[PDB]
Coordinates of C-alpha atoms and ligand atoms in Angstrom, one line a residue:
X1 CA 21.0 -30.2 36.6
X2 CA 22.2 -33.1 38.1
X3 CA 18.5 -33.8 39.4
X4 CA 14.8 -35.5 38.1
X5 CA 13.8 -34.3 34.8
X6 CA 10.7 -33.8 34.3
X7 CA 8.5 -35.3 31.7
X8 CA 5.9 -32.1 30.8
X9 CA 8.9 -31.5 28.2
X10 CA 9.0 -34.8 26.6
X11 CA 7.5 -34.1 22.6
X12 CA 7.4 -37.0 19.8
X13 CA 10.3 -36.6 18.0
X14 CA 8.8 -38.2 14.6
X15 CA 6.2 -35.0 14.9
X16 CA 9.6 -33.1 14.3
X17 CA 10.2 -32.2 10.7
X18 CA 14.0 -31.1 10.3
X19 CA 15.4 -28.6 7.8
X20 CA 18.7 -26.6 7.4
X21 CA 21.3 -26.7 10.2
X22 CA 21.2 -23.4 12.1
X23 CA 24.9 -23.9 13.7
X24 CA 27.2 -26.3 14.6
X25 CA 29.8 -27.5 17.3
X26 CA 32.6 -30.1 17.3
X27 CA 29.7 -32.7 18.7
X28 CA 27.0 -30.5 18.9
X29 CA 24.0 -28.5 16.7
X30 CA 21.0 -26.9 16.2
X31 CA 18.8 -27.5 13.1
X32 CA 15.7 -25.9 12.6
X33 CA 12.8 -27.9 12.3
X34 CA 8.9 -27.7 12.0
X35 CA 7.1 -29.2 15.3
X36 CA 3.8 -30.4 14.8
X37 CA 1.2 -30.3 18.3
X38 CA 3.8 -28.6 20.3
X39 CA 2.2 -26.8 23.7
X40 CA -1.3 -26.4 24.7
X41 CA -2.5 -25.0 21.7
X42 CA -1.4 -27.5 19.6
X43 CA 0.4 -25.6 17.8
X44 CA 2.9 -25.9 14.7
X45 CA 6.1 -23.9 14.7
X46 CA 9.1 -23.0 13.0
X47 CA 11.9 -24.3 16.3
X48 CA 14.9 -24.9 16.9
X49 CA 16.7 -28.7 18.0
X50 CA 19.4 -29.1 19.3
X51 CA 21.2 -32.2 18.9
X52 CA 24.9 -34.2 19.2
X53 CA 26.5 -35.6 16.2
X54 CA 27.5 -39.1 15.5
X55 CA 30.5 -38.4 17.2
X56 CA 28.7 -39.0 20.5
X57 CA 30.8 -39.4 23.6
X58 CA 29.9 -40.0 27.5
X59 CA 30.9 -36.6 28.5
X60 CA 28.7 -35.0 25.4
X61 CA 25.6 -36.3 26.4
X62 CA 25.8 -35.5 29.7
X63 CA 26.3 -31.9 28.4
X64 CA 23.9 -31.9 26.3
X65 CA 21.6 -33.0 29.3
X66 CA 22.8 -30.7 31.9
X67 CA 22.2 -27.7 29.7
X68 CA 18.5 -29.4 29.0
X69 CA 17.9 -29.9 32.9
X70 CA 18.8 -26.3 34.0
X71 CA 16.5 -25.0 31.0
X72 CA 13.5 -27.0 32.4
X73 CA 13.9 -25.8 35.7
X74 CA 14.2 -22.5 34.8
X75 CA 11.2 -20.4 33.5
X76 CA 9.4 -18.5 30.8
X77 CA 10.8 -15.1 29.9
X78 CA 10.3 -12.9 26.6
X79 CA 14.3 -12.4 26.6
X80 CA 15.4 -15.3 27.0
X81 CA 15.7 -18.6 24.4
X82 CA 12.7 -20.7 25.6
X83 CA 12.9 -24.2 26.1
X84 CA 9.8 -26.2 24.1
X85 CA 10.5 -29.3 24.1
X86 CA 13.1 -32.5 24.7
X87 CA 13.2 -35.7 22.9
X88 CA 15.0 -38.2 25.7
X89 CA 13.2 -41.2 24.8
X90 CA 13.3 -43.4 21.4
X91 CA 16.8 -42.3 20.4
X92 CA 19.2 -39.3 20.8
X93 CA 18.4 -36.5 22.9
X94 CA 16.9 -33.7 20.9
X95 CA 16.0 -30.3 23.0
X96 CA 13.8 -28.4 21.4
X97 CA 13.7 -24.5 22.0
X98 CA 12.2 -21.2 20.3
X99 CA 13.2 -20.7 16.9
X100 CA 14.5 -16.9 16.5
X101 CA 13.7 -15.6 13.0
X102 CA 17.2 -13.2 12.9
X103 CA 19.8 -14.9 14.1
X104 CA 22.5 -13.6 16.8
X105 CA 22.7 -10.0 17.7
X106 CA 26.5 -9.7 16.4
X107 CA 25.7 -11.0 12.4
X108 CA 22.7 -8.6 12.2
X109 CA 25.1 -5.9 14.3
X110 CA 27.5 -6.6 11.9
X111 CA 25.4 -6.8 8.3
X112 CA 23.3 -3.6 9.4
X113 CA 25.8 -1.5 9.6
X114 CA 27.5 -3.2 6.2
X115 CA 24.1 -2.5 5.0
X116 CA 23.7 1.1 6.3
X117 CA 26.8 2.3 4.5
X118 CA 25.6 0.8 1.1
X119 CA 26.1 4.3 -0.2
X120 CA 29.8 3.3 -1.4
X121 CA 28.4 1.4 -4.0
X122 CA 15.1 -0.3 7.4
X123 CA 17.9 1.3 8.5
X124 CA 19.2 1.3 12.8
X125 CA 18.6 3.7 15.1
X126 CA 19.8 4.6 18.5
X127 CA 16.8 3.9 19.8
X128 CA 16.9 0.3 18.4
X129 CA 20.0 -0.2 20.3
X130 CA 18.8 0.8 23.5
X131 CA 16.0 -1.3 22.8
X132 CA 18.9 -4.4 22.4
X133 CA 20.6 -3.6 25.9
X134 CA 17.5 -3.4 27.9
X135 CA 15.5 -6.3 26.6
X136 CA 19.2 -9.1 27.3
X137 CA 19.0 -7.0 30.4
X138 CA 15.5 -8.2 31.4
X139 CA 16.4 -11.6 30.3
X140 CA 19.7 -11.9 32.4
X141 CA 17.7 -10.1 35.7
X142 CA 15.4 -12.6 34.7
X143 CA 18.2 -15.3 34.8
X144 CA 19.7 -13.7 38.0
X145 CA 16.3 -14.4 40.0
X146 CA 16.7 -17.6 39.3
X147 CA 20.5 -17.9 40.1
X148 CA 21.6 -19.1 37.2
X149 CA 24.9 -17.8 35.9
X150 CA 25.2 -17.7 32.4
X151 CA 28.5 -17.6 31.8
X152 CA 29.0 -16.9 28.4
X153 CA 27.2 -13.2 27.7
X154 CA 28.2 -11.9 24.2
X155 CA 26.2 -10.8 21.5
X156 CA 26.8 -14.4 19.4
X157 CA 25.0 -16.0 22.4
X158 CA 21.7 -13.1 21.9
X159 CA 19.2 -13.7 19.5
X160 CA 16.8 -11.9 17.8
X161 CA 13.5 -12.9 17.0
X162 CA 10.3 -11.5 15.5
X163 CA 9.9 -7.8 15.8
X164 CA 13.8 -7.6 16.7
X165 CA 13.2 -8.4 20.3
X166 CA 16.6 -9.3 21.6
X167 CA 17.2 -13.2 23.7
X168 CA 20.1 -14.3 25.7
X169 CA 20.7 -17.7 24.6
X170 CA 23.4 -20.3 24.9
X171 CA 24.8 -22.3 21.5
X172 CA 27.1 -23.8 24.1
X173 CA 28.2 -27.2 22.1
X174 CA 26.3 -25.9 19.2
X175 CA 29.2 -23.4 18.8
X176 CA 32.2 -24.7 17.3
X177 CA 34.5 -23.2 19.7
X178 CA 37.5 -25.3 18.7
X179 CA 38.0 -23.2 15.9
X180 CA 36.4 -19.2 17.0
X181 CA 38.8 -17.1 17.6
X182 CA 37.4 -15.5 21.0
X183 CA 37.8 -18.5 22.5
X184 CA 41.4 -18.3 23.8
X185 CA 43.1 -21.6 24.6
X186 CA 43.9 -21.7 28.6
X187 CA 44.7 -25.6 29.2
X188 CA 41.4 -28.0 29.9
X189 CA 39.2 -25.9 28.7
X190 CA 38.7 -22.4 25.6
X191 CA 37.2 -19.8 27.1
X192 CA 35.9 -16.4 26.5
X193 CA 38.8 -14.5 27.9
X194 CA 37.3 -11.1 26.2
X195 CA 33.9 -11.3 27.5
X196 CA 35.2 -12.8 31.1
X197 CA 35.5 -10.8 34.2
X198 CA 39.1 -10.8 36.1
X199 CA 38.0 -13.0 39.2
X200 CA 36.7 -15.6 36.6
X201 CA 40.0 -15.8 34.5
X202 CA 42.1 -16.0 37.8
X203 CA 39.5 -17.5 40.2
X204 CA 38.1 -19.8 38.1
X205 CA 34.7 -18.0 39.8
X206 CA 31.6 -17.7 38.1
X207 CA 28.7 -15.4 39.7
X208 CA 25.7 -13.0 38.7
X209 CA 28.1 -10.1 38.4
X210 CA 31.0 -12.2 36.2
X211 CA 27.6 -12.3 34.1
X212 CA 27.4 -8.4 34.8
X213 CA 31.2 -7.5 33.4
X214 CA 30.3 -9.7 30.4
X215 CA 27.2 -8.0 29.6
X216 CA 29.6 -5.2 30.1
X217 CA 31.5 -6.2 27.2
X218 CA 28.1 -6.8 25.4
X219 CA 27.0 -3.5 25.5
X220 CA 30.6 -2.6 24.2
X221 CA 29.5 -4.5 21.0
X222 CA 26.4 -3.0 20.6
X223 CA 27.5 0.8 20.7
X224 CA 30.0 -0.4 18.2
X225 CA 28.2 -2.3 16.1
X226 CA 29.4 -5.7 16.2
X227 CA 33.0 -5.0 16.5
X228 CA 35.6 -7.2 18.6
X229 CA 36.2 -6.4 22.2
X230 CA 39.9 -5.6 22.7
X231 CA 40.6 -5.0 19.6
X232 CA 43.9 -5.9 17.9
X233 CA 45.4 -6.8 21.5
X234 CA 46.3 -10.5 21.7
X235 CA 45.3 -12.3 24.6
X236 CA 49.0 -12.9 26.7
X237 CA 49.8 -12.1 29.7
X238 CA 50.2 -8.7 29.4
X239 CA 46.1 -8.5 28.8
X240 CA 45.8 -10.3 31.5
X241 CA 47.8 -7.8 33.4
X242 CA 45.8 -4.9 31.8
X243 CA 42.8 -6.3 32.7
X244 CA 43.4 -6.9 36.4
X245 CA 44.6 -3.5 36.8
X246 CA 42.0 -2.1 35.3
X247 CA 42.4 -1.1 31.8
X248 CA 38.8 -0.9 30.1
X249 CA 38.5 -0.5 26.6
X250 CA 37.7 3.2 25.0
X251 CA 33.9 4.8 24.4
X252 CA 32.8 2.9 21.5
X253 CA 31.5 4.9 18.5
X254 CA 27.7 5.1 19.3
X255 CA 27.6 5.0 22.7
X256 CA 26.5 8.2 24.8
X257 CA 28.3 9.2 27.8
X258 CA 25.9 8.1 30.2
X259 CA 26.1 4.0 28.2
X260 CA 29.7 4.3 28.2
X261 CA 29.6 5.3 32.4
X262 CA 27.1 2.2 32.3
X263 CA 29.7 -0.3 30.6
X264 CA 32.2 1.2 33.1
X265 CA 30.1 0.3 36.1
X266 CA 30.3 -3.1 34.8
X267 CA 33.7 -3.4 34.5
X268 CA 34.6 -2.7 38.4
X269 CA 37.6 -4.8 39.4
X270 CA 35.5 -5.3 42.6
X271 CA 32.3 -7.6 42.0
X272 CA 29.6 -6.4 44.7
X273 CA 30.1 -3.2 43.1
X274 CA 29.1 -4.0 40.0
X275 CA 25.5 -2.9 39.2
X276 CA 22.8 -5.8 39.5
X277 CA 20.9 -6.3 35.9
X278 CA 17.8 -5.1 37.5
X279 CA 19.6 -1.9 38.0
X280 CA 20.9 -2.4 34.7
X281 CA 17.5 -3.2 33.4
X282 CA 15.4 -0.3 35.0
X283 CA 18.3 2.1 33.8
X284 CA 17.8 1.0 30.0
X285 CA 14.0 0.9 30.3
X286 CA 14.4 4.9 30.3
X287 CA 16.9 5.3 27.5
Ligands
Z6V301 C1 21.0 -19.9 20.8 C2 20.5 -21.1 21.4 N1 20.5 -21.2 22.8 C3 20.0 -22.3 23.4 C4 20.2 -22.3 24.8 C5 19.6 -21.3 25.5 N2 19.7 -21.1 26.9 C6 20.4 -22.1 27.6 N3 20.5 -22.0 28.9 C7 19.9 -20.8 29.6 C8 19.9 -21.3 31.1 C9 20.8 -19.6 29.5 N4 20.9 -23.1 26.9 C10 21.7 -24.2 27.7 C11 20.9 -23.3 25.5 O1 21.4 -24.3 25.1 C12 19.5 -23.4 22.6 C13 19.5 -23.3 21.3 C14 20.0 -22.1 20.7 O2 19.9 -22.0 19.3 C15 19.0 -21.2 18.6 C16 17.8 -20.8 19.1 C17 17.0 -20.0 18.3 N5 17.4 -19.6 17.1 C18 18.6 -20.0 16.6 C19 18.9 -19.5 15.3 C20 20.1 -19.5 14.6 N6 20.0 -18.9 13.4 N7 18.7 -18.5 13.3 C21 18.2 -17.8 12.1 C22 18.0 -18.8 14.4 C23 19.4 -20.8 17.3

């Protein structure tokens, strides 16, 4: 970001076949698309591109750029969304990443567990949750090497792909924030108040462990299956009161004792002693 991008990413963007829209931002989306000789291989693939609308601004495309630069600098993980491809010559930017076949973690959270109770007229298992936590894990220790602060950890920014393998990814503009209701208005900019830690609401300070409390709160969403962090508490001052002096939300429905001790962990007022997502990683890998 804010450096040389490299051109091993560039991909002809007439070899890119586009279908439906996956999401959508105020000036941002992703639409799937079919890519045709994309890698070594050659290969054709079901991806995703993500793309401003015709409401394109300075500041957008910048955005848009930024979020393309730190990708390509990044790395290959199996947990994380993987960048492709970019398209930054012959028109607008188009940056091409993995396509995941099932969506975010919270819909599929949220329609397996409609789907489980059918019976008021495959199915989840615990292991299958464990199986969630540890593989974002991997990917944010896999971010964390890299010193990259996500920033925005919630299961609506985890995707799952084939076999149900879980990736942290980022809709960043793709999202239309404007309008989501866990994205709390706080002046210049909506942010994630729910899924923030304390220094980061009052600091304005972003680090590996504000990742930590968020994934935190991810985990909370897991073990409940998809349901909102906080729930029924409106974000005022008085939450961010609660917050800072440590009120942490309830064991959530699924969770054992010893997840629930591992959300808690995550949610120390003090940052260094937060657990480090390899710790949080090697943990899971047992469960
Ligand atoms: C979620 C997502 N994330 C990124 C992204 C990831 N990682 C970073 N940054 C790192 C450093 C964390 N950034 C900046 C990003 O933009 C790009 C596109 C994207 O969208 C997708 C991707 C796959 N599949 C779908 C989908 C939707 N529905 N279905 C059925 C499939 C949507």
């Amino acid at each position: 970001t804010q450096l040389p991008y490299n051109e091993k990413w560039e991909f002809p963007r007439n070899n890119l076949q586009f279908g439906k829209t996956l999401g959508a931002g105020a000036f941002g989306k992703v639409v799937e698309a079919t890519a045709f000789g994309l890698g070594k291989e050659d290969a054709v693939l079901k991806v995703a591109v993500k793309m401003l609308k015709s409401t394109a601004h300075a500041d957008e495309k910048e955005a848009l750029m930024s979020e393309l630069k730190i990708m390509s600098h990044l790395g290959q993980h199996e947990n994380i969304v993987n960048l492709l491809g970019a398209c930054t010559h012959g028109g607008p930017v188009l940056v091409i990443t993995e396509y995941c076949t099932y969506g975010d973690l919270l819909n599929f959270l949220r329609r397996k567990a409609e789907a489980m109770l059918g019976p008021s007229l495959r199915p989840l298992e615990l292991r299958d949750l464990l199986h969630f936590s540890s593989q974002v894990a991997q990917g944010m220790a896999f971010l964390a090497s890299k010193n990259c602060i996500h920033r925005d950890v919630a299961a609506r920014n985890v995707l799952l792909t084939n076999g149900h393998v879980a990736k942290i990814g980022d809709f960043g503009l793709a999202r239309d924030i404007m309008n989501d209701s866990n994205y709390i208005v706080k002046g210049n900019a909506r942010l994630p108040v729910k899924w923030m830690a304390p220094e980061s609401i009052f600091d304005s300070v972003y680090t590996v462990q504000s990742d930590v409390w968020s994934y935190g709160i991810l985990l909370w969403e897991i073990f409940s299956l998809g349901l909102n962090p906080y729930p029924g508490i409106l974000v005022n001052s008085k939450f961010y009161k609660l917050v800072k002096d440590g009120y942490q939300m309830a064991q959530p429905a699924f969770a054992p004792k010893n997840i629930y001790s591992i959300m808690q962990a995550c949610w120390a007022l003090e940052p260094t002693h937060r657990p480090t997502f390899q710790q949080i990683t090697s943990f899971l890998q047992e469960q």
